[PDB]
């Protein structure tokens, strides 16, 4: 689909990943019934009408901590999806920052480790490829914390 994808892509029902242009595209947002946007990039802030935002200023760097944003991202995504609505998670390219948060979400709502969750994302968005630092954070999450996050999900929403 090219290095910034070909348009926003459905990953699971009610969950899409795209680039910054996709996130401003009224036609795509309308077509995909997107009512929530999780913006994770340098300059993230609410932009459009008709959309609930979660904005996480973050760099696409191994020095960027995204683990500390997993819980708020998962809550935001999950509450949207439980209401039958659709969430777009976007970054600059829809390759790394956004992909990482979606992987953490998939890992929490399935029994998948990060590699199986990445496979799931790539099936919908072929350009998905978190930076090697984000891969390490996902590996640590898999080892030490995803089990607690799964239980939290069950307790809060199950």
Ligand X SMILES: O=[N+]([O-])c1ccc(OP(=O)(O)O)cc1
Give the binding site for ligand X (CB under 6 A): 41, 60, 91-98
**Which CB, 34 or 66, lies closer to ligand X?**
66
- What is the closest distance, in whole angstroms, from the C-beta atom of residue 111 to ligand X in the complex? 26
**Which CB, 34 or 56, lies closer to ligand X?**
56
- What is the closest distance, in whole angstroms, from the C-beta atom of residue 158 to ligand X in the complex? 31
- What is the closest distance, in whole angstroms, from the C-beta atom of residue 59 to ligand X in the complex? 8
Query: CA-CA distance, 2 to 155, in Å (whole number)?
Result: 40
What phi and psi, each to the nearest 5 degrees, are found at residue 23? Answer: -70, -15
**Which CB, 30 or 65, lies closer to ligand X?**
65
- What is the closest distance, in whole angstroms, from the C-beta atom of residue 130 to ligand X in the complex? 8
- What is the closest distance, in whole angstroms, from the C-beta atom of residue 154 to ligand X in the complex? 30
**Which CB, 36 or 41, lies closer to ligand X?**
41
Query: CA-CA distance, 21 to 145, in Å (whole number)?
Result: 33
**With breaks defined as C to next N over 2.5 Å, after which residues does the chain break?**
none
Please state, in angstroms and as integers, the Cα–Cα distance from residue 125 to each residue in 62, 151, 155, following that order: 22, 28, 31
**Which CB, 132 or 154, lies closer to ligand X?**
132
What phi and psi, each to the nearest 5 degrees, are found at residue 2? Answer: 90, 170
Burial code (b: 16+ CB inside 10 Å, e: under 16) for 61-92 equals eeebebbebbeebbbbbbebbeeeebbbbbbb
């Amino acid at each position: 689909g090219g290095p910034m994808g070909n348009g926003m892509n459905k990953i699971l029902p009610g969950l899409y990943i795209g680039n910054f242009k996709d996130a401003r595209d009224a036609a795509q947002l309308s077509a995909n019934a997107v009512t929530h946007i999780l913006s994770v990039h340098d300059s993230a802030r609410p932009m459009l009408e008709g959309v609930k935002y979660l904005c996480i200023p973050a760099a696409d760097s191994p020095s960027q901590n995204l683990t500390r944003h997993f819980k708020e991202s998962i809550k935001f995504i999950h509450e949207c999806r439980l209401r039958g609505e659709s969430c777009l998670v976007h970054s600059l390219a829809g390759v790394s920052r956004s992909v990482t948060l979606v992987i953490a979400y998939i890992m929490t709502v399935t029994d998948f480790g990060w590699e199986d969750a990445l496979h799931t994302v790539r099936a919908g968005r072929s350009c998905a490829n978190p930076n090697v630092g984000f891969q390490r954070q996902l590996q640590e999450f898999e080892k030490h914390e995803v089990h607690q996050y799964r239980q939290w999900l069950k307790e809060e929403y199950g």
